[PDB]
Design a protein around this ligand. Sequence first.
Ligand code: UQ1
Ligand code: SF4
Ligand code: SF4
Lengths: 29, 171, 48, 125, 208, 97, 176, 112, 115, 386
Amino acid sequence: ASKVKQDMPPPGGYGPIDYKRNLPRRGLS
Amino acid sequence: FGREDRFLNYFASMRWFGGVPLISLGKETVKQPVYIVDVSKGIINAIKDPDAKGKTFAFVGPNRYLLFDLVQYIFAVAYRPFLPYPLPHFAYRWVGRLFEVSPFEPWTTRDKVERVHMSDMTLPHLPGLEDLGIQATPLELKAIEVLRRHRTYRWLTSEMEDVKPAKTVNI
Amino acid sequence: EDNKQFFGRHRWVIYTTEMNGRDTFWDVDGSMVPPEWHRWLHCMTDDP
Amino acid sequence: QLIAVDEKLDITTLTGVPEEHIKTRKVRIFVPARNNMQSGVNNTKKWKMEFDTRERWENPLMGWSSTADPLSNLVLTFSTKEDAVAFAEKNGWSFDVEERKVPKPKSKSYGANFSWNKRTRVSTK
Amino acid sequence: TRPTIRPRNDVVHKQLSAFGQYVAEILPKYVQQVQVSCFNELEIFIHPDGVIPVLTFLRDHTNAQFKSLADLTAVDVPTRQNRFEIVYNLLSLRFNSRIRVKTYTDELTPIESSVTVYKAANWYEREIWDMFGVFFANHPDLRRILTDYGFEGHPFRKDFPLSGYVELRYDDEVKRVVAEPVELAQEFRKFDLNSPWEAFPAYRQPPE
Amino acid sequence: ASATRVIQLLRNWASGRDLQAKLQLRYQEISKRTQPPPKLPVGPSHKLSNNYYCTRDGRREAMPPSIVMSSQKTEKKAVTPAPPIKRWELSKDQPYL
Amino acid sequence: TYKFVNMREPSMDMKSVTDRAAQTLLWTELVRGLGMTLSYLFREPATINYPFEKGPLSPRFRGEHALRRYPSGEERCIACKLCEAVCPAQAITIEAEPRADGSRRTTRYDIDMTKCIYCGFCQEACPVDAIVEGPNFEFSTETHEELLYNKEKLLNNGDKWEAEIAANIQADYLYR
Amino acid sequence: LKKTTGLVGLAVCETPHERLKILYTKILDVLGQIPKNAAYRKYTEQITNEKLGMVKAEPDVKKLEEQLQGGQIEEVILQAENELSLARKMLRWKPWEPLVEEPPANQWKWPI
Amino acid sequence: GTSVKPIFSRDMNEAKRRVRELYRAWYREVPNTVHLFQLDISVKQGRDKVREMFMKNAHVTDPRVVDLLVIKGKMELEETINVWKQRTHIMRFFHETEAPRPTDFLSKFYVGHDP
Amino acid sequence: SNLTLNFGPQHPAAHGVLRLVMELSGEMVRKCDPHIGLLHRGTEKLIEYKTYLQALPYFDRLDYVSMMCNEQAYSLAVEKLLNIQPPPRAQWIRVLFGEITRLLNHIMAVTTHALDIGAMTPFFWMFEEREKMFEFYERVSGARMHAAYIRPGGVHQDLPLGLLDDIYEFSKNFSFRIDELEEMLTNNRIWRNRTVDIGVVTAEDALNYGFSGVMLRGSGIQWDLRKTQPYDVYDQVEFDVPIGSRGDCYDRYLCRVEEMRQSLRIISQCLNKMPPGEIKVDDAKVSPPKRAEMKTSMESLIHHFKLYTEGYQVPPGATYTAIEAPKGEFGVYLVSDGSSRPYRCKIKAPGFAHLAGLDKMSKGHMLADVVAIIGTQDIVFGEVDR
Ligand SMILES: COC1=C(OC)C(=O)C(CC=C(C)C)=C(C)C1=O
Ligand code: SF4
Ligand code: SF4
């Protein structure tokens, strides 16, 4: 009769996840 | 005769030599070719016929042709130029000897040459396809399905009722 | 096993050259793995 | 406007059904009998149209049951007998109709279990 | 009552009922019935002759603006004198709403094509013609869409058999694909599943 | 990965980003293929009392649709199927790509 | 809430105009694409060495069917026909009769694997864990007939794969 | 002043107040030929009169778009044209007449 | 009155006229079908087959049914003209691989139970 | 006369089984006539011969690039007809796997579009990510694509104990793969030449032709079923709807890439907010009981027997239920007569209407342009033919 064990997010939360476009300039004039 | 036969295909393939060598110009040989589907259906009906136990049948087509006329019709259905020339029997035997040396399937053989030039027997005392419920299919309705493959691109679409069926030596 | 390889290449099998009756020096197939090693090799468990 | 056809409805030429499965078939229009293993009556409310049973034979390879008629599983549901009759007639099928069987009302008396002079008195409960 | 039961919304129910009354008031010539289901879906049952007007009204009216035809299909109920039920599902993006329009036909009665109102109808009607045999008048190009070339019958009718009447194979004698009457090594097994006890008292029918 | 640092620099210069930080191949940060057993709680209808099925029967609360304007059977403001949809707002996070 | 994907306006100064001219005449973005492909060239490929290396699976994987036994050796199947009733493809054929010792057992248990969709509904329906989808997926054949399984084949599969099937069931039955 | 309404194929309209006035006047003229007791006439006249009144009372286009709640005044113009076409079609159809051909007895009975 | 609405034709005369137009179109098309699909049958065989199909529905006396049959025939002709059909589809009219079934009572009694 | 050409079904760019009969003047496309039904399997009649649980796996095979989304739509329709409600954990799992499924579908669409136009590498780069998501599918259900996981009671099973960590690990890196694909395609002048101003459709024409999803949003129509008509928990997540302005192929490609980014955003939110509890409705006359209860208590065994033999009865009535599937609006018109088997089930596939508009979209274009337009409509013929 132990504690309920389920797949859950960790205490607090997960780290932030990047989703935005990332295309650096990376060039000369 | 049929799509994979060695009768209509054999004569059609002789265009590669340019002319058709015929013993006595093929004017002293009579043939009575029979359709493949008729033979297969006859075998099936013989299997299902209780009366055909120890019987001997003869499956032949409905018409008899002189060899020259049959080859002319074969070349007309294929729309190829017909150039028949007479070859003596011994020379044709020599050609068969020459072709027999192939380790693969020979193009022709001396035995094959003899069979081609030999007239079909008439055995009226034996039962035939009609005794098994089959109406023999004439060559005039089935030659195109075999010989259309041997036409060039120009003549590929020609219909079956165009090529004026050949003459038959019947009775 | 080699746990420094990425997932999928960290475990492998070198097949025998002679199973029940046939020579398997060249002809090997995945159906030669017995069920226990089959469970280990497909990563359905961690314990060999 | 209208044309006022004066013919009998007949759609057999448009249904795609082969001729053999039109003329040689007999359909049955009936209210299904209650399954005697249960008391529920909810399966005896609608009319059913079904086709005559044809041949079934054992499959040689696995011994399965093989059929050659395509209407062996066709069962149609209708609200009334007249609707089923109209459907069968317009589809060209010849039919047999069976009248609905309804259980007759019965006279139940719990007191009769203990009659003073009748045979209906029960010897056990 | 709380956790396992779907909650109901009464504001949408009232709004849909009011709009159904509105449509019925505007078009008394064609509207035969209006219903609102208890999961908040609004349907309008009309005479077939009003297929084009009603739809047009719903498409172009300022207060309706149902400018998207989500789906158009048919339902076959053999027990009805008019066998086929024609169903239009319309979506209004302006008012974020959905509406259903229903009519009926039989095997020999054409229904006016609604391609002039909605372009999307063009293929849908074709499908209805292919699967049920309902003819649409003034259709720009009406022909089979789903079935094989030369296929006979309308497979989505209730009296059409599940496996059909013909099956295909390759024949080597004629060197081509041929069609023959269906023969099944294992017949499909019909299951009789309905319980003899009634499930839903709220839908009980009078005993006639 | 096992790539030498020169190859790492060449990869990062060619792609323009640090590839070693986010690798396509997953090495050891994934979950173990053997896990402890779960426990899996039950649900809201697992009570021992005050749990009659007639009070939680969703299927039996369905009823036939409400009929408005059967044909067989003033102020009158116009109505719409629903209030007009409210105009969308433009993405305080990133309005333009 | 919504965002625009293609609603920007380029700068019209001499600097930006000359930068765009250089991009047009010197193929800068194409060079960037070439650099990306060159970067991918020097990465380790994701290919595994099949059949010496295998793809990862889980204990829930649905594969070749099998019939199981109790530890005593008695078959688990009691011919309730729940799997036959639930099978979405009608791939299961069952015949049963009383055994010589009065037991309720099958005389026919057929699965057409060319009808089956490998949904695993039969193993969910089974009340005694008799029919299971095993872990094996390498059982291609040379003929159609080899894929029409009878009871003997399924029992042989169970006896062949029980060592893995029991361990797989042990890892997941608490989720069922 | 505004550019790129944002909908492909919908051009920017200059002088939209005049266009809306013309369209609403035409709609009212067409509705004037429908019988007085018809519901379509009175409902459409009511809504069109409200829209025309709010059009005549606002010279600012953005605030007019906010008040009409019609989504980008060019779509308001398009909807007005659609309504005028519908009014002509309904004048032709006359759908205010009584119902024709009540359905069969159990046409709409479900289940079965 | 029976209060029915038409599809195209008002009575049987217009329906017969449409039938004749469809028959003319099919008769004209047959030789082109023989040429294009490279059929081994003759033009006479194709026209006899066309005639046979029409004769099958000759009995129908309802103009709406005739109208629908003409619509279906026009659809089939359109399929044939555009070569949407293949050779197998055209040859399916001839049932070349189906063994003949005798209609006599004795033959049916011998083979099986079917009537 | 014009030249008549058969494009497919045996063609690399035919997206499966499609017979595009084209009338061409040179390489100019005068007319497109799509012939379909080469994958018509008669799904709806077959469904008429099944119980509600037995019919669920057919929706996996309708749109076999977005399986769990079809499962969700069918489950929502059956739930509406049943007047029952899935538990919160099941709904959160449903939305999470729907977004993962949208990622899978968008990868397939964009990469095969680029493959048809002539760029083969991004296909290979992104199909490894597809394989990892297939692993997620298999770990949750035992099958890589045809899961049959989402059911009218919720979901079949709860998550395995380590799944959320692996989903997080994949999600924290997928954005760089999106960036690499964008670097390959977005600013390439050849890609823009092959995509910009190709297959332009106006907003009014898109509305009248029955288009949905990206095929509307590329033309500026501000519509999304997850925002206007949310279904499971989509009202509890934050994301943006990408909108185009040109109505061409390039804008729709940009919209699909941005939708992948928004899907990553939603997946992050779903991972952080997964609640505890049961995963199917606690009503044994609908959802089967647990195995332990079925082998212990009489009522549980009875309900298990009846649910797996006869199936649950659905009250009579008809519903039209629609979802924002990755290809557009996916709908089901489901009719119940009161029994355990549906009377009628009409499936509405966005690809049907999208392909019906192919001839309109191809006016004034060439053969390669038509190939691009075929790719931009995101067509799978399992759902088109049904
Ligand atoms: C790069 O080589 C390949 C192809 O050739 C271009 C393909 O067509 C295909 C098939 C996919 C397309 C959409 C036909 C695959 C899978 C492939 O790997
Ligand atoms: S896995 Fe599914 S289809 Fe296959 S036998 Fe089991 S229930 Fe039938
Ligand atoms: S395998 Fe299981 S479900 Fe199938 S008949 Fe045997 S005991 Fe019943």
